[PDB]
Write a protein that binds this ligand. Structure first.
Ligand code: SF4
Ligand code: SF4
Ligand code: F3S
Ligand SMILES: [Mg+2]
Lengths: 267, 534
């Protein structure tokens, strides 16, 4: 499973859409095969692991209890309403699972806005009482590094892990516990349309000639000015990002963005 | 060693989301099954009262495996509600991104989700790489050498010798397993291609980002069309085209030959996991308001009666809750849907899932690649018929073999090959349309205060529909009815087993501690539980 030599990662799925897992599969230089063969030992991951059922849960127990230590990477919010019953794995609530496992980790990374801040299932009226990891588990002393976004840039996960492995510590974190090396700038201050913003040159509609010519998307709802992420710099899939595809930022790396950034097409 | 008693698989891994499968086994064969979905989020509840334009952004987060599909369904739904007819280029771009999604999704499913049910990766260490290379080169026009495969073996040997098996820890094949049939060389070929597919899928997903901003969770759709003016440029089209061509080569030269070599080794799997009824919505429209303008057409088949394909009547869908963790027992058409959670624990008041149970004219319907392929075949679709016939011929089996776990797995490949080719046709059509001077990608529209709308997508797992009731210009009701809901939802108020449940009856289980046969059938449906429950 794991013992010596590559650092052990236990990857947990709570209330999630698996988009964060999929983002990790997009890893580029290093690619995911290098990450799981050379860099790390991926010791539990429900999406791709061979074992199922009891065999899978024994793999989890072996990983978590290893004297060698593990890193937890957590995808999804924790449903806390009704004593956690809205989300169960192996007939345990996700709240229970995370409460037992996460305090045992050497380091915890909350990956994606759901794990960091509660995410889509936490949007009003939040029927499942979904919480981010640090909120849910504050009483146990868990302080996960928050890598926000819906999903985040996988560059930001790999970079955080590499930093931690090298330095044996978290990188500098902002007041939302996000690494400043990735989340220190607004989307907007990095945006190629900023000169149009400065000039008050806004697209009035998506069909307009102004939108064709690449004018600023603020009037159409762009949340770049209030969103911290590295999207314009790193891009996604080595090729694009929302504003370059003509669509406003929806604020997806910010807490409560589903309710704070809506309606998405207004500012 | 023929077991009687229960078997529970929880978690079912190598799916999206949180599934518990329960079976009763008698004398080594499954006699009964329950499909229990163990996470609820409540996106339909969350959407109430919001701006209909916001729906696609929320609903895309139904699922990141079948990313984009729900954004597309919601946008089709709101487009329909407001009565906008999007420009031809918006249809082309939306269709091209969807075709790319199919290719990414199905490649990852076969290799990264399904294949470990049939491939013993550790047995690849025992293989003769020169023999394996000869076999690989015999099934594909792509030539593979002994050195190519030894490099994979060496990397695997280093990994295994570390004792840190990572994702292979406690695999059902470790130590050997009587239900694992492949020889070492075929295991090595499949393992090499599993690894190759980890990098190829990066390209397949990138194709979506070229027009669609990013993968996962695209960001280029709006009511009225699309936003990506850059998608009109020769440079972006060329970038897409290059990624598509490489992805299609992998489909044709790697995936399909591997699928056939594994299917041939597991031909007994034609005997398990059959289903009775099929529903499909069609996909890739010329006309956003006419399902019959789609490259694959909609249809309904009951009791495998493919000579009598019935039209799809959207009013004949109702979603049951009697065996689900919702209030009461009343099935609802989605324009009158209700999402009222009420948990009773496993089998409390005969309820065992967060999924509703969709029924069509009261019947449980398989949807997904086998439905799409079989209905298109039976409609005379020439590309589907050519590929399907070639597959059946290669495998030496008749059409009845498709009604099975193997059949369904094959159908997933068939549709991948057909859609990979058709993306090229759409791409050409799109180029041709630009060349005529049509540079429009979004149309204006107005929000009604009161309206109903529906959007239909045939996603990689089948018929997806999003349903809106607009009231005071806001979301009055928004209901998702998702492919995995059809296939993996529970029983209805007539106690009819769902497709996955029914398909499990008869499954042999060699080793109740390592019940890979259950996984083979369940995985053949490609479950997505975040999709099914939302
Ligand atoms: S952060 Fe977004 S992409 Fe990641 S699990 Fe949550 S909804 Fe899905
Ligand atoms: S498009 Fe958005 S991020 Fe770019 S300049 Fe305008 S408001 Fe800022
Ligand atoms: S929507 Fe999210 S992915 Fe970047 S451009 Fe805005 S933070
Ligand atoms: Mg629903």
């Amino acid at each position: 499973l794991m013992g010596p030599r590559r650092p052990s990662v236990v990857y947990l799925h709570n209330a999630e859409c698996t988009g964060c897992s999929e983002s990790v599969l997009r890893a580029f230089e290093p690619y995911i095969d290098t990450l799981i063969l050379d860099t790390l030992s991926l010791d539990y991951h429900e999406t791709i692991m061979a074992a199922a059922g009891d065999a899978a849960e024994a793999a989890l127990e072996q990983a978590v209890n290893s004297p060698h230590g593990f890193i937890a990477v957590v995808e999804g919010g924790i449903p806390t309403a009704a004593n956690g019953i809205y989300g169960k794995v192996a007939n345990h609530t996700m709240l229970d699972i995370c409460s037992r496992i996460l305090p045992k980790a050497q380091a915890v990374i909350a990956y994606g806005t759901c794990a960091t801040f509660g995410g889509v299932q936490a949007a009003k009226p939040n029927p499942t009482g979904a919480k981010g990891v640090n909120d849910a588990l504050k009483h146990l002393g868990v302080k996960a590094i928050n890598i926000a976004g819906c999903p985040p840039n996988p560059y930001n996960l790999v970079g955080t892990i590499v930093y931690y492995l090298k330095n044996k510590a978290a990188p500098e974190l902002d007041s939302l516990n996000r690494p400043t090396m990735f989340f220190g700038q607004t989307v907007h201050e990095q945006c190629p349309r900023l000169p149009h913003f400065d000039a008050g040159e806004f697209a009035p509609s998506f069909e307009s000639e102004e939108a064709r010519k690449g004018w600023c998307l603020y009037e159409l709802g762009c949340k770049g000015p209030v969103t911290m992420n590295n999207c314009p710099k790193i891009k996604f899939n080595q090729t694009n990002w929302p504003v370059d595809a003509g669509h406003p930022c929806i604020g997806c790396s910010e807490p409560d963005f589903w309710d704070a950034m809506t309606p998405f097409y207004q500012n | 060693s023929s077991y009687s008693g229960p078997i529970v698989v929880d978690p079912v891994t190598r799916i999206e989301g949180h599934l518990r499968i329960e079976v009763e086994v008698e004398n080594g064969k499954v006699k009964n099954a329950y499909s229990s979905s163990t996470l609820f989020r409540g996106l339909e509840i969350i959407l109430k009262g919001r701006d209909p334009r916001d729906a696609q952004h929320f609903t895309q987060r139904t699922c990141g495996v079948c990313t984009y599909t729900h954004a597309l369904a919601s946008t089709r739904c709101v487009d329909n509600a407001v009565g906008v007819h999007i420009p031809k280029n918006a249809t082309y771009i939306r269709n091209l991104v969807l075709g790319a999604q199919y290719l990414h999704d199905h490649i990852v499913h076969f290799y990264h989700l399904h294949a470990l049910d049939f491939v013993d990766v550790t047995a690849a260490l025992k293989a003769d790489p020169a023999k394996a290379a000869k076999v690989a080169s015999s099934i594909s026009p792509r030539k593979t050498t002994a050195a190519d495969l030894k490099a994979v073996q060496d990397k695997l040997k280093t990994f295994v010798e570390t004792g840190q098996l990572g994702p292979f820890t406690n695999a059902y094949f470790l130590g050997g397993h009587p239900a694992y049939y492949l020889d070492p060389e075929t295991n090595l070929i499949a393992t090499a291609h599993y690894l190759e597919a980890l990098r190829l899928q990066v390209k397949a997903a990138r194709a979506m980002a070229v027009f669609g901003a990013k993968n996962p969770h695209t960001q280029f759709t709006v009511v009225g069309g699309v936003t990506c003016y850059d998608a009109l440029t020769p440079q972006r089209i060329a970038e897409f085209e290059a990624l598509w061509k490489e992805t299609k080569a992998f489909v044709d030269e790697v995936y399909i030959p591997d699928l056939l070599v594994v299917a041939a080794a597991y031909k007994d799997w034609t005997q398990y996991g059959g289903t009775d009824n099929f529903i499909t919505f069609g996909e890739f429209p010329k006309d956003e308001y006419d399902l019959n303008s789609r490259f694959f057409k909609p249809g309904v088949v009951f009791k495998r009666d493919f000579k009598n394909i019935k039209p799809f009547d959207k009013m004949q869908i109702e979603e049951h809750v009697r065996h689900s963790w919702y209030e009461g027992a009343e099935a609802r058409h989605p324009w009158k849907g209700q999402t009222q959670p009420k948990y009773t624990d496993l089998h409390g008041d005969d309820r065992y899932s967060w999924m509703k149970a969709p029924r069509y004219m009261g019947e449980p319907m398989e949807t997904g690649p086998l439905a799409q392929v079989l209905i298109a075949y039976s409609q005379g679709h020439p590309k589907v018929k050519a590929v399907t016939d070639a597959v059946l011929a290669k495998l030496g089996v008749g059409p009845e073999a498709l009604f099975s776990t193997l059949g369904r797995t094959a159908a997933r490949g068939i549709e991948t090959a057909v859609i990979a080719e058709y993306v090229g046709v759409m791409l050409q059509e799109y180029k041709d349309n630009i060349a005529k001077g049509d540079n429009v990608i979004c149309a204006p529209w107005e929000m009604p205060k009161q309206a109903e709308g529906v959007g239909f997508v045939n996603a990689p797992r089948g018929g997806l529909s999003h349903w809106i009731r607009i009231e005071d210009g806001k979301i009055g009701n928004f209901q998702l009815v998702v492919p995995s809901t059809w296939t993996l939802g529970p029983r209805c108020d007539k106690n009819k087993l769902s497709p996955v449940e029914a398909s499990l009856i008869g499954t042999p289980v060699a080793d109740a501690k390592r019940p890979v046969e259950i996984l083979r059938t369940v995985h053949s449906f490609d479950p997505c539980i975040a999709c099914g429950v939302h």
